[PDB]
Design a protein around this ligand. Structure first.
Ligand SMILES: NC(=O)c1ccc[n+]([C@@H]2O[C@H](COP(=O)([O-])OP(=O)(O)OC[C@H]3O[C@@H](n4cnc5c(N)ncnc54)[C@H](OP(=O)(O)O)[C@@H]3O)[C@@H](O)[C@H]2O)c1
Ligand SMILES: NC(=O)c1ccc[n+]([C@@H]2O[C@H](COP(=O)([O-])OP(=O)(O)OC[C@H]3O[C@@H](n4cnc5c(N)ncnc54)[C@H](OP(=O)(O)O)[C@@H]3O)[C@@H](O)[C@H]2O)c1
Lengths: 285, 285
């Protein structure tokens, strides 16, 4: 017994959301500035409207997934009178401050609001292993959980809508850091004719052990105390110089590991040479 | 039946190697510049020698795990006459160039040689899930695999000893990048009273999906072609600005995500705004 659902925004991610809702048996209505992106969805049973307003009017449950929140206000400004009694689930990326403003704005026009963060690329939409993080009122999340569950694993962080976006940017920073370090290392072994496809399964496996380091170091970060029982900042400064040397000789730009070395040196200068790497957080605050 | 084994270097890692060998039933001999670090090992059945030479003479199988390769040459130079017929397994961190030199040097004194990289902190030594990467001759690795298996999962990368260290520095760079991005995000959510121990399980889970991004992007890196089918560099530049804004307002140093943004901007300027993030490798060569 799924409800009628509308998706506003049919980009890479918006499309995928609409396709999953469609396959889950929802009557699916869509809108996008560029109508051509709807074509494949329409062929499969989605209704395309000419304007956002008609799309909003067509369903009690409205998802937005556009570039940013300015665009959201821009495309929905003409529909504000039609929002009353609706639920608006905003899966657009933004900052905590934008998320809290958007909730106030939606409530001012009589709509229920949840702010969400999609922790997957488009192929994983629909997979219950992929996290979707939500902030907003309990009641709204509980009433709509079953529909959200179509898209992935819906995790309600709490009543503050900014929480979703807070976790999101923190998690994205983690992702960009990992991707770039991976790419740097891949360039390095690649200069020796080791293919990325050969190296990467070792990287993937290694990330399991690295995730274990995160688990170990969490209670250290909360305590502000970083015992060097496993490996020390000083030892890590010595080994990063091997990375820098190897990369420099193979034509790989070292901005990233230079910065990481500097951050370790900063922590050492602050008295953390014999502490664990988690002590590096002392020089990020 | 396990062989007699010597460990040279009883730091955080060297200790752990010796403790595992001891528990596996090996007659275990040890040496360290600072003898007091041997005490707990001696109490449990390890023999401590006064010099490295006596330690080398005591076993057919010698592991070295000291700060760096200069220290290795320094402590082993006086034992070169005792190396003949031995196997020397060097688990010291270093560069590929150092690894190849060390093999030539060990061969010149009649020893078999393997170069290794420990992909775990000390607690994981002994666990068959933890990767130990090896480079050096097939025959040597095959003859000694059973002893190496006591320490972890021994993976022979091939005949070139520099391969172990090549993968190692690349993998360490990945680890440092991940840890620092994790810590930056942890600082961020921590300003809002979300503990590291609350945030980290989300980070760990997220890393599974990120590892999947690495798998997808590997064939793109090898091809030099980066289709923007999932998510684009331009969209990622927009979302990293939400991270920068959120972090700046909460007293978190933004050197890291500023560099990551710059790297994405560099890729965009080179024509990769519509490509996947893997295109960023184009700007690291
Ligand atoms: N792709 C991912 O893996 C992923 C994952 C998690 C979160 N997200 C987030 O989801 C959101 C959308 O991302 P996407 O990857 O789907 O990006 P995308 O393919 O570039 O789509 C951007 C969407 O915004 C619309 N748009 C942009 N400017 C507009 C304007 N001035 N007026 C009306 N519509 C406008 C686009 O319409 P046109 O089609 O007419 O240009 C399109 O629907 C972003 O906040 C992104 O950070 C993406
Ligand atoms: N800990 C880890 O998690 C880990 C993981 C993988 C690889 N590694 C690598 O293992 C190696 C040793 O690491 P560790 O973590 O055991 O660090 P550590 O606890 O600082 O050990 C350093 C070792 O080197 C010796 N040493 C240093 N300078 C010396 C000198 N001038 N003469 C003689 N001996 C000297 C030390 O002897 P004293 O005790 O007398 O100072 C000690 O045995 C490094 O290459 C490191 O990158 C470590």
């Amino acid at each position: 017994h799924p409800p009628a659902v509308t998706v506003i925004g049919l980009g890479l991610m918006g499309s995928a959301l609409a396709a999953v809702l469609l396959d889950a048996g929802c009557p699916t209505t869509v809108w996008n500035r560029s109508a051509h992106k709807a074509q494949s969805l329409v062929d499969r049973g989605a209704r395309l409207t000419g304007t956002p307003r008609e799309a909003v009017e067509a369903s009690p449950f409205v998802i937005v997934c556009v570039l940013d929140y300015d665009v959201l206000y821009s495309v929905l400004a003409p529909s504000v009178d039609a929002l009353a009694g609706k639920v608006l689930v905003n899966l657009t990326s933004g900052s905590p401050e934008q998320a809290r403003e958007a909730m106030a704005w939606a409530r001012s026009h009589g709509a229920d609001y949840l702010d969400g963060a999609i922790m997957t690329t488009p192929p994983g939409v629909g997979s219950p292993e992929m996290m979707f993080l939500y902030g907003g009122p309990d009641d709204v999340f509980d009433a709509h959980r079953q529909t959200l569950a179509f898209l992935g694993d819906p995790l309600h962080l709490g009543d503050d809508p900014g929480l979703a976006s807070l976790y999101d940017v923190a998690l994205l920073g983690l992702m960009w850091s990992t991707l770039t370090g991976w790419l740097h290392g891949t360039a390095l072994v690649g200069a020796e004719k080791t293919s990325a496809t050969t190296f990467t399964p070792f990287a993937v496996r290694w990330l399991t052990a690295v995730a274990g380091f995160l688990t170990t170091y969490a209670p250290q970060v909360d305590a502000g105390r970083y015992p060097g029982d496993d490996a020390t900042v000083d030892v890590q400064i010595a080994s990063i110089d091997h990375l820098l040397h190897a990369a420099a000789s193979r034509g790989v730009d070292n901005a990233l590991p230079e910065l990481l070395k500097s951050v370790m040196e900063q922590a050492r200068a602050a008295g953390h040479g014999s502490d664990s790497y988690a002590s590096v957080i002392e020089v990020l605050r």
